[PDB]
Amino acid sequence: MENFQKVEKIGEGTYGVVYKARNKLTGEVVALKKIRTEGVPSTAIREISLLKELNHPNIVKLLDVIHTENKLYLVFEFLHQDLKKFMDASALTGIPLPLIKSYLFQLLQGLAFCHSHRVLHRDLKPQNLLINTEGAIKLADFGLARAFGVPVRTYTHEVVTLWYRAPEILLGCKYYSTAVDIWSLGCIFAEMVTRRALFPGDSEIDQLFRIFRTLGTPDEVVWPGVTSMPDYKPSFPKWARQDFSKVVPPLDEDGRSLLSQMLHYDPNKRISAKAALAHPFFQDVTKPVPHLRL
Numbered sequence: 001m002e003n004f005q006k007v008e009k010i011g012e013g014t015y016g017v018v019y020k021a022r023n024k025l026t027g028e029v030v031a032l033k034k035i036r037t038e039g040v041p042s043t044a045i046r047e048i049s050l051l052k053e054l055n056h057p058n059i060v061k062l063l064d065v066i067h068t069e070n071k072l073y074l075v076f077e078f079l080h081q082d083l084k085k086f087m088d089a090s091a092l093t094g095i096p097l098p099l100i101k102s103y104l105f106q107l108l109q110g111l112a113f114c115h116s117h118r119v120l121h122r123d124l125k126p127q128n129l130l131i132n133t134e135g136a137i138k139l140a141d142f143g144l145a146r147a148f149g150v151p152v153r154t155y156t157h158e159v160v161t162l163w164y165r166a167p168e169i170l171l172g173c174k175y176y177s178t179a180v181d182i183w184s185l186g187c188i189f190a191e192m193v194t195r196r197a198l199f200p201g202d203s204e205i206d207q208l209f210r211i212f213r214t215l216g217t218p219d220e221v222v223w224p225g226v227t228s229m230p231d232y233k234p235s236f237p238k239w240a241r242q243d244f245s246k247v248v249p250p251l252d253e254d255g256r257s258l259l260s261q262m263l264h265y266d267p268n269k270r271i272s273a274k275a276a277l278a279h280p281f282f283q284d285v286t287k288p289v290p291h292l293r294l
């Protein structure tokens, strides 16, 4: 739009490229997401528009949705840093535990809010988790999946990450729930603690087999109905489960306990965002300040 001046390519999401822009009028700076051209589906517009109402302290506010020349522009509140970069910058030392815990608690609140309104993210990842100098962390691109859909190949000619995708999605379940966001957050939680991706799969089956190698191949005992999933193959190699003490050290037992409940195979046994908030892991939760470099 003519009311925005692109300052820099802040990223390239699934539905489109994201830019840091300057409203030539208001003078406010925002992150402008342009989504590519038959005229854009009406259903999407109406769905995306509803998102303008779901406002929460831990959800990146969607200021306006601009649909001109039959193109889509999502105007979001701008934040100075994503979790990915912050992590890379913390690589040598690592993010302090008090901060990791504050971030998880805030993300969980955001999720609780979204899940209570029957809205899920479906594609949580370090790249759409934004932080500010205030010690707050926010979820970006919420509800955009129900608007369109994330494939395995992107227009940016790059590659879609499956590292945080819940097993029910990889196994073909087409009617997944809020539980998929909990799984992703769990994978992110573990990544913050170890400074290494939990399940860095390079393909769908490679992704599924890395999960299996660590948590063990799911069966009807631990996941009733798993063998009935569309893509479940009786020929899946049978891997034994591995202790969480080796999965995410030196995370304390409360943290390990919580992560374990966030990583349960059965979506129904997977702890909810609301319940996660009552976990003893957050008994001593605080809100530290990140040492950000901008």
Ligand SMILES: Cc1nc(C)c(-c2ccnc(Nc3ccc(N(C)C)cc3)n2)s1
Binding pocket: 010, 011, 012, 013, 018, 031, 033, 060, 076, 077, 078, 079, 080, 081, 082, 085, 127, 128, 130, 140, 141
């Ligand atoms: C994918 C994304 N989708 C949305 C809606 C994003 C967003 C929203 C608000 N601020 C920022 N800020 C921001 C993003 C990246 C960086 N980098 C330095 C990579 C700095 C600030 N990013 S990111």
